[PDB]
Amino acid sequence: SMEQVAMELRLTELTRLLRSVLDQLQDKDPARIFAQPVSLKEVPDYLDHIKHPMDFATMRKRLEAQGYKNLHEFEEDFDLIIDNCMKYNARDTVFYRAAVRLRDQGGVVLRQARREVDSIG
């Protein structure tokens, strides 16, 4: 149907906007601490601590399959990156501190993203 195509175009355009958001948030992680999944070879106990691991590469795979239906779903995955790190790692660590800085800098980007998603529909 033509309605299904229109909905598909809206999803494609959201995917475009989320790709630009993802690029902007990942620039706030210049150390690349959040770029890839925590390695279970290198942190064998990880899944005992963290039940829903997340990272920027995993988000990009979902994004490219158009697997985010709305901005809330995308934000959920970004918050998992931050929140997972802030539980597993202690306050005095470069990992924890990187997550704080990513959260703080990312909030700015996300605030305008929300306006754009509502504005453009």
Swiss-Prot record:
Cell compartment(s), UniProt: Nucleus; Chromosome
Sequence position, cross-link Glycyl lysine isopeptide (Lys-Gly) (interchain with G-Cter in SUMO2): K41
Free-text tissue specificity from the UniProt record: Highly expressed in testis.
Annotated Bromo domain residues: 9-113
Assembly, per entry: Component of some HBO1 complex composed of KAT7/HBO1, MEAF6, ING4 and BRD1/BRPF2. Component of the MOZ/MORF complex composed at least of ING5, KAT6A, KAT6B, MEAF6 and one of BRPF1, BRD1/BRPF2 and BRPF3. Interacts (via PHD-type zinc finger domain) with unmodified histone H3. Interacts (via PWWP domain) with dimethylated and trimethylated 'Lys-79' on histone H3.
Function field: Scaffold subunit of various histone acetyltransferase (HAT) complexes, such as the MOZ/MORF and HBO1 complexes, that acts as a regulator of hematopoiesis. Plays a key role in HBO1 complex by directing KAT7/HBO1 specificity towards histone H3 'Lys-14' acetylation (H3K14ac), thereby promoting erythroid differentiation.
Protein name per the record: Bromodomain-containing protein 1
Natural source organism: Homo sapiens
